[PDB]
Every structure is written in structure tokens, then in C-alpha cells.
């Protein structure tokens, strides 16, 4: 009944090396440790994913290319553009070891849930949901979320994937778009020009998996109250229709106010309410991180959410620790929404929710 916390000092150091989010893993763990939450959890050392484990989703051609460019850090390789390596996903030295580490950590978490040693397994450094079978994408080199679901598949016949990242979890949706045994649900910003450009409400999966992909297109400026209304409405209908045996939850903090992407206007409290709703299902749950580019706020959010999982109220004052100086200007745990408009029209939201309700009527 004690939550599993995927952590090792080696694992955090590796995750710190990602160019797009340097030192974020350290800051998240350091704050969690400063609140002493790790003492209330079962700390589990992550394994490194084998080539074969990664090949359960990713193609050998792609994996071999990753390993190749990882050796010398071969930027400007002729085939790199084809495999998605570029501005978003640079071909840096040791990137293969980075991929295998994160993929292994999520698999380890999934294996803990399978063994029944816990009901909640946490990997805050995972959740890289953009990666395709043969293509890096959106800062993601390996889709650890897919690898984790594939592992959970060995025991749980129906798996629900819930993606609360700011961006559409297109990698995970595409991976399972043709099956009805994994349902993916994504709430995300949807607007022409905004990455990755997919995930309209009309995208519902294909073939046998038709209506087993749920997409909730949302506009800039949404805050806690409306977001939870939308989330609770969709998840209630999804839970009744799909009846999941396990849940994979992606909680990218790039929705949080203060993020440089400045799109959604959320606080960890709002996200926490969505988390609580899923947690009271009492199903095996894999918790992943994802986006989050205000590093202090991302740490604030996932530390708060960890407290939520443990059912603990945390002190409002950030305790002194290695990165205390980064928590200005008020050095508190809570985050204040920005004073900017919510661009979501209630009639648009209502139309979206009705479209989804109609789609889920087919799910039987």
C-alpha cells in the first residue's frame, strides 16, 4: 500500500543531462527530499532497459541509429533528419544511455505494479510521450510511456492512459491507435502552429481501436476550476465505458502558470484534484512526469502532487535545500495564476464534451 518511488543518484544525474531541461531531475528530487516525502515511500532503483526491451516498441533501425550517433555525438549525420534528430532532439553524446535509463525506469515502475508490491509507482523523470517507433520528437528520444504500458499489458487486460501534459501525447496515441485494449485520453493545447499540431476532438483512433482514443482540444489561459470540470467530465464517462484495470498518468507541468510557454494558467492544486479523482479508483497507477520548463515550478508541482499521493499536507514555506535560491521571489510552495484571460468559450467546451460523450457510446 506504500507508493513506489523510482530513484537512484545515478538515475537522477543521467536525467539531469537532458539539454532541454538541465538539472530539473535534481531539483525535483531535492525538493521532495527536503519535505522528507521519500521517507514515506518505497525507494526502488531503476534498471537500465535492454535493447530487446526497447525494441518492443521502437524499430531496430531507429535504435541502432541512436546508438550510433550517441557514440561520438554525431550532429549533422545524413540520416538524422529522417529519425527526427534535430533542433528539438539534438544528437548529443551518450543520448542512447540516457534513453535506455529512462525507458528502464518506467519499465521498472510497471514491473513493480505487476508484482503487486505497490498500487502507485512514481517516475517523475519519465513521461516522454512524443517519440514514435522510428522517430525522435519533442525532446523525446524514447517513448518510456509506451514501454511501460506494454509491460503492464502482461497483466492488465485494459489500460487507461491519461495525458495531462500541455502538449498532445501523439506518440502514445499513435502506438495504440489500432487497439481497444489501451485507451488514451489527452487534454492539451490545440491551435494551428502549436506543437505537435495533432489531437483534435475528431481524432478517435483507427480500425479496432476506433473511439478508443479521446482528445480534448483546449485553448490558452485555462485555470484550475474549469480544467477540473472538463477533466472530471471526460474521465467519469471514460471510466464507465472502458472500465480500466490499470492507469498510466502523465502529468507534464508545462500547464502550470510561470512556464515560459505561457499557455495554460494552472496550479498544482488543480492538477492535484484530477489526480485525486483517478486515485480513488484504487487501480494500479503509474505516475509519470513530462514537460515543465519553469524548473522550480515543475519541482513545486510534482512535490505537491507527491504529497497528494501520500495524503499529506505540505508546509507552504520552501525548506532550505540545495536549490533554495531558485524559488524566488516568495519562496513558497503555492503558485499564483497569471492575470491573463481564459480564451476558452463555454459553448466550444460544451460542444467538445458532447462530441466525446457521443464517441464513448460506441465503447462497449
Amino acid at each position: 500500500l506504500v507508493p513506489v518511488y523510482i530513484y537512484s543518484p545515478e538515475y537522477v544525474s543521467m536525467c539531469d543531462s537532458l539539454a532541454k531541461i538541465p538539472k530539473r531531475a535534481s531539483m525535483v528530487h531535492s525538493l521532495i527530499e527536503a519535505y522528507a516525502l521519500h521517507k514515506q515511500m518505497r525507494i526502488v532503483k531503476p534498471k537500465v532497459a535492454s535493447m530487446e526491451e526497447m525494441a518492443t516498441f521502437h524499430t531496430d533501425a531507429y535504435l541502432q541509429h541512436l546508438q550510433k550517433v550517441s557514440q561520438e555525438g554525431d550532429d549533422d549525420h545524413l540520416d538524422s533528419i529522417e529519425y527526427g534528430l534535430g533542433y528539438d532532439c539534438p544528437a548529443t553524446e551518450g543520448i542512447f544511455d540516457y534513453a535506455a535509463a529512462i525507458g528502464g525506469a518506467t519499465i521498472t515502475a510497471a514491473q513493480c505494479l505487476i508484482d503487486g508490491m505497490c498500487k502507485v509507482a512514481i517516475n517523475w523523470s519519465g513521461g516522454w510521450h512524443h517519440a514514435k517507433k522510428d522517430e525522435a520528437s519533442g525532446f523525446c528520444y524514447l517513448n518510456d510511456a509506451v514501454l511501460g504500458i506494454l509491460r503492464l499489458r502482461r497483466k492488465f487486460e485494459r489500460i487507461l492512459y491519461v495525458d495531462l501534459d500541455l502538449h498532445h501525447g501523439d506518440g502514445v496515441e499513435d502506438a495504440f491507435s489500432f487497439t481497444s485494449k489501451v485507451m488514451t485520453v489527452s487534454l492539451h493545447k490545440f491551435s494551428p502552429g502549436f506543437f505537435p499540431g495533432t489531437g483534435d476532438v475528431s481524432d478517435v483512433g483507427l480500425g479496432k481501436g476506433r473511439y478508443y482514443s479521446v482528445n480534448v482540444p483546449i485553448q490558452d489561459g485555462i485555470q484550475d476550476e474549469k480544467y477540473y470540470q472538463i477533466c472530471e467530465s471526460v474521465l467519469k464517462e471514460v471510466y464507465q465505458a472502458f472500465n480500466p484495470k490499470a492507469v498510466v498518468l502523465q502529468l507534464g507541468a508545462d500547464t502550470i502558470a510561470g512556464d515560459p510557454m505561457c499557455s495554460f494558467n494552472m496550479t498544482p492544486v488543480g492538477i492535484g484534484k484530477c489526480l485525486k479523482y483517478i486515485l480513488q479508483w484504487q487501480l494500479a497507477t503509474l505516475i509519470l512526469g513530462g514537460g515543465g520548463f519553469n524548473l522550480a515550478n515543475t519541482a513545486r508541482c510534482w512535490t505537491y502532487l507527491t504529497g497528494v499521493i501520500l495524503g499529506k499536507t505540505l508546509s507552504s514555506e520552501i525548506p532550505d535545500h540545495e536549490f533554495f535560491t531558485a524559488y524566488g521571489p516568495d519562496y513558497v510552495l503555492e503558485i499564483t495564476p497569471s492575470c491573463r484571460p481564459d480564451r476558452n468559450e463555454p459553448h466550444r467546451i460544451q460542444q467538445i464534451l458532447n462530441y466525446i460523450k457521443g464517441n464513448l457510446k460506441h465503447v462497449v
Binding site: 533542433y87 528539438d88 512524443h130 520528437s137 525532446f139 502552429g193 502549436f194 506543437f195 505537435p196 499540431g197
Partner: peptide, 5 residues
């Protein structure tokens, strides 16, 4: 192909 980022 969009840019993230």
C-alpha cells in the same frame, strides 16, 4: 513537422 522548442 512542427517545432516544440
Amino acid at each position: 513537422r512542427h517545432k516544440k522548442x
